[PDB]
Amino acid sequence: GSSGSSGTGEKPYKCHECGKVFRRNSHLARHQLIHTGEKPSGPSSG
User: For binding to Zn ion (CB under 5 A), which residues are involved?
Assistant: 15, 17-18, 20
- Return the bridge partners of 13, or none: 22
8 versus 18: smaller Cβ distance to Zn ion:
18
Q: How many CB atoms lie within 10 A of CB 11?
A: 6
- In 3-state terms, what secondary structure has residue 22? strand
Instruction: Give the residue with the Cβ less far from Zn ion, 1 or 37.
Output: 37
Query: What's phi and psi for 29, nearest 5 deg?
Result: -55, -55
Q: Give 3 or 36: the residue with its C-beta nearer to Zn ion.
A: 36
The least distance separating Zn ion from the CB of residue 14, rounded to whole angstroms, comes to: 9
